[PDB]
Design an enzyme around this catalytic site. Structure first.
Site, PDB file in Angstrom:
ATOM      1  N   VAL A  27      82.199  24.590  86.802  1.00  0.00           N
ATOM      2  CA  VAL A  27      81.784  25.173  85.535  1.00  0.00           C
ATOM      3  C   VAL A  27      81.795  26.713  85.600  1.00  0.00           C
ATOM      4  O   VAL A  27      82.038  27.387  84.598  1.00  0.00           O
ATOM      5  CB  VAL A  27      80.394  24.647  85.089  1.00  0.00           C
ATOM      6  N   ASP A 163      67.570  33.021  87.146  1.00  0.00           N
ATOM      7  CA  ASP A 163      67.678  34.222  88.009  1.00  0.00           C
ATOM      8  C   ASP A 163      68.981  34.965  87.779  1.00  0.00           C
ATOM      9  O   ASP A 163      68.982  36.188  87.563  1.00  0.00           O
ATOM     10  CB  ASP A 163      67.530  33.913  89.529  1.00  0.00           C
TER      11      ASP A 163
HETATM   12  C1  LIG Z   1      80.051  27.224  77.962  1.00  0.00           C
HETATM   13  C2  LIG Z   1      79.076  28.045  78.840  1.00  0.00           C
HETATM   14  O1  LIG Z   1      78.360  27.173  79.773  1.00  0.00           O
HETATM   15  C3  LIG Z   1      77.118  27.571  80.208  1.00  0.00           C
HETATM   16  O2  LIG Z   1      76.613  28.629  79.825  1.00  0.00           O
HETATM   17  C4  LIG Z   1      76.385  26.700  81.230  1.00  0.00           C
HETATM   18  C5  LIG Z   1      75.072  26.839  81.686  1.00  0.00           C
HETATM   19  C6  LIG Z   1      74.022  27.871  81.273  1.00  0.00           C
HETATM   20  C7  LIG Z   1      74.882  25.848  82.624  1.00  0.00           C
HETATM   21  C8  LIG Z   1      73.611  25.562  83.413  1.00  0.00           C
HETATM   22  O3  LIG Z   1      73.022  24.508  83.205  1.00  0.00           O
HETATM   23  N1  LIG Z   1      73.145  26.430  84.334  1.00  0.00           N
HETATM   24  C9  LIG Z   1      73.818  27.706  84.648  1.00  0.00           C
HETATM   25  C10 LIG Z   1      74.094  27.811  86.147  1.00  0.00           C
HETATM   26  N2  LIG Z   1      72.885  27.433  86.933  1.00  0.00           N
HETATM   27  C11 LIG Z   1      73.375  27.309  88.312  1.00  0.00           C
HETATM   28  C12 LIG Z   1      72.256  27.034  89.341  1.00  0.00           C
HETATM   29  C13 LIG Z   1      71.165  27.896  89.455  1.00  0.00           C
HETATM   30  C14 LIG Z   1      70.175  27.627  90.415  1.00  0.00           C
HETATM   31  C15 LIG Z   1      70.279  26.518  91.263  1.00  0.00           C
HETATM   32  C16 LIG Z   1      71.385  25.668  91.139  1.00  0.00           C
HETATM   33  C17 LIG Z   1      72.368  25.925  90.179  1.00  0.00           C
HETATM   34  C18 LIG Z   1      72.303  26.131  86.540  1.00  0.00           C
HETATM   35  C19 LIG Z   1      71.917  26.114  85.089  1.00  0.00           C
HETATM   36  C20 LIG Z   1      76.074  25.147  82.708  1.00  0.00           C
HETATM   37  C21 LIG Z   1      76.374  23.960  83.604  1.00  0.00           C
HETATM   38  N3  LIG Z   1      76.952  25.677  81.877  1.00  0.00           N
HETATM   39  C22 LIG Z   1      78.326  25.179  81.696  1.00  0.00           C
HETATM   40  C23 LIG Z   1      79.357  25.987  82.532  1.00  0.00           C
HETATM   41  C1  LIG Z   2      64.019  32.448  88.275  1.00  0.00           C
HETATM   42  C2  LIG Z   2      63.239  33.616  87.664  1.00  0.00           C
HETATM   43  C3  LIG Z   2      63.228  34.799  88.617  1.00  0.00           C
HETATM   44  C4  LIG Z   2      63.639  36.076  87.896  1.00  0.00           C
HETATM   45  C5  LIG Z   2      63.658  37.272  88.836  1.00  0.00           C
HETATM   46  C6  LIG Z   2      64.817  37.155  89.818  1.00  0.00           C
HETATM   47  C7  LIG Z   2      66.026  37.946  89.306  1.00  0.00           C
HETATM   48  C8  LIG Z   2      66.480  38.861  90.438  1.00  0.00           C
HETATM   49  O1  LIG Z   2      66.989  40.002  89.792  1.00  0.00           O
HETATM   50  C9  LIG Z   2      66.275  41.236  90.130  1.00  0.00           C
HETATM   51  O2  LIG Z   2      66.845  41.867  91.285  1.00  0.00           O
HETATM   52  C10 LIG Z   2      66.713  43.304  90.990  1.00  0.00           C
HETATM   53  C11 LIG Z   2      67.768  44.010  91.873  1.00  0.00           C
HETATM   54  O3  LIG Z   2      69.059  43.524  91.444  1.00  0.00           O
HETATM   55  C12 LIG Z   2      65.219  43.737  91.052  1.00  0.00           C
HETATM   56  O4  LIG Z   2      65.087  45.111  90.664  1.00  0.00           O
HETATM   57  C13 LIG Z   2      64.369  42.806  90.138  1.00  0.00           C
HETATM   58  O5  LIG Z   2      62.952  43.016  90.265  1.00  0.00           O
HETATM   59  C14 LIG Z   2      64.750  41.337  90.396  1.00  0.00           C
HETATM   60  O6  LIG Z   2      64.003  40.472  89.555  1.00  0.00           O
END
Ligand SMILES: CCOC(=O)c1c(C)c(C(=O)N2CCN(Cc3ccccc3)CC2)c(C)n1CC
Ligand SMILES: CCCCCCCCO[C@@H]1O[C@H](CO)[C@@H](O)[C@H](O)[C@H]1O
Ligand SMILES: CCCCCCCCO[C@@H]1O[C@H](CO)[C@@H](O)[C@H](O)[C@H]1O
Ligand SMILES: CCCCCCCCO[C@@H]1O[C@H](CO)[C@@H](O)[C@H](O)[C@H]1O
EC number: 2.7.11.24
Length: 337
Positions: A27, A163
């Site tokens: 994705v 994040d």
């Molecule tokens: C058409 C545009 O499509 C989208 O924007 C889109 C989104 C937002 C998601 C989604 O659900 N995410 C975004 C990515 N983190 C990765 C992650 C983060 C932390 C831990 C593990 C994985 C998960 C939650 C997906 C699957 N898509 C489809 C590509």
């Molecule tokens: C999942 C929710 C967590 C959100 C905060 C994590 C995002 C990390 O991104 C950011 O990194 C910066 C440097 O790039 C720092 O200045 C910020 O304090 C930090 O939050």
């Protein structure tokens, strides 16, 4: 008992995952992401393979920060972990890290489409962002890059703050971050919420600067040039002197900018989009604002444990960071489901 793993290439990357996860489908690409089906739960999931997690100190450090952060985030409107795995069977063979979370499938642009949303729908989306931000902020974390791509949404409009996500990013940044202030309030994130909200309501970007200075000009045009109280809070002599050299400009009336919006929406945007970050509404305060009357539940707006940011800001050898990340993988307990 260790799960059985299988491998397959997708976009030049070998992914080895437990048999649990099937139908891996790219994705996006910190790391690369596949949608997948988790057979053990019946859930569709996003699987993130970290990129070269231990090849340098700084990759190792980043890896540890992301894992530890995600393990600590347990809230409905913030991204959290369903699983974390490595094929590795020991510390010595530990080279790859994969994170699993609920597949949302979309982010804020996708659901939105540049079309304006109903007030009810804007209410529900902003309520969830604020609810997540209260939680993040209670852990002493500042997001600092809140924007539509950093907000995952499913088709029932359920939202999670990310994040890192998968349309300029500058557009949503607080003025003080555009100017490299190094002391920041949590309300930098509140500015970002005001920007998103404005867009959802009007179907247009609030501050679509072509570059950094154009963006600051657009901001100053809406919120006015800094008053006397704000100017007194500027440490940099050159900044102070530049700002004073500028032609004073009044704050606009937001009723004239947001024609026909819910007057409660207008009232909340005025409290979010104030130039002085000390005067901006906090996440907890905004949740109690009358705009959210149909959704606000003061008994279901949870707060986090303070988060020890000092452990991820250490200066350690690769093998130290690698071993610490390894222990975080082992110590992981999946959430109730
Ligand atoms: C058409 C545009 O499509 C989208 O924007 C889109 C989104 C937002 C998601 C989604 O659900 N995410 C975004 C990515 N983190 C990765 C992650 C983060 C932390 C831990 C593990 C994985 C998960 C939650 C997906 C699957 N898509 C489809 C590509
Ligand atoms: C999942 C929710 C967590 C959100 C905060 C994590 C995002 C990390 O991104 C950011 O990194 C910066 C440097 O790039 C720092 O200045 C910020 O304090 C930090 O939050
Ligand atoms: C173009 C000049 C206007 C931009 C000024 C941004 C004002 C932001 O507000 C300032 O935020 C600082 C940074 O976090 C805090 O230290 C100050 O208390 C607060 O006044
Ligand atoms: C408080 C931070 C001080 C930043 C000083 C920025 C000065 C930029 O200066 C301005 O930038 C643009 C040209 O790129 C034009 O819109 C203006 O005519 C020009 O004077």
């Amino acid at each position: 008992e260790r799960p059985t793993f299988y491998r397959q290439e997708l976009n030049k990357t070998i992914w080895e995952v437990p048999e649990r996860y099937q139908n891996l489908s790219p994705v996006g690409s910190y790391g690369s992401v596949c949608a997948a089906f988790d057979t053990k739960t019946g859930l569709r999931v996003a699987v993130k393979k970290l990129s070269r997690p231990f090849q340098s100190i700084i990759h190792a450090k980043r890896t540890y920060r992301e894992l530890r952060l995600l393990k600590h985030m347990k809230h409905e409107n913030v991204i959290g972990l369903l699983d974390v795995f490595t094929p590795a069977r020991s510390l010595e063979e530990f080279n790859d890290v994969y994170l699993v979370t609920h597949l949302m499938g979309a982010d804020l642009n996708n659901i939105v489409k540049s079309q304006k949303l109903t007030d009810d729908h804007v209410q529900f989306l902003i309520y969830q962002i604020l609810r997540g931000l209260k939680y993040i902020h209670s852990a002493d974390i500042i997001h600092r890059d809140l924007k539509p791509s950093n907000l995952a949404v499913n088709e029932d409009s359920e939202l999670k703050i990310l994040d890192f996500g998968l349309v300029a990013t500058r557009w949503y940044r607080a003025p003080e971050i555009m100017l490299n202030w190094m002391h920041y309030n949590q309300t930098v994130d509140i500015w970002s919420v005001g920007c998103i909200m404005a867009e959802l309501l009007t179907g247009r970007t609030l501050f679509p600067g072509t570059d950094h200075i154009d963006q600051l000009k657009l901001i100053l045009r809406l919120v006015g040039t800094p008053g006397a109280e704000l100017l007194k809070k500027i440490s940099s002599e050159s900044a102070r002197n530049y700002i004073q050299s500028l032609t004073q400009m009044p704050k606009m009336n937001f009723a004239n900018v947001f024609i026909g919006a819910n007057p409660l929406a207008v009232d909340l945007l005025e409290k979010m989009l104030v130039l002085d970050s000390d005067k901006r509404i906090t996440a907890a305060q905004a949740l109690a604002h009358a705009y959210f009357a149909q959704y606000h539940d003061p008994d279901d707006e949870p707060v986090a444990d303070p988060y020890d940011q000092s452990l991820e800001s250490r200066d350690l050898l690769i093998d130290e960071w690698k071993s610490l990340t390894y222990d975080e993988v082992i110590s992981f307990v999946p959430p109730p489901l």
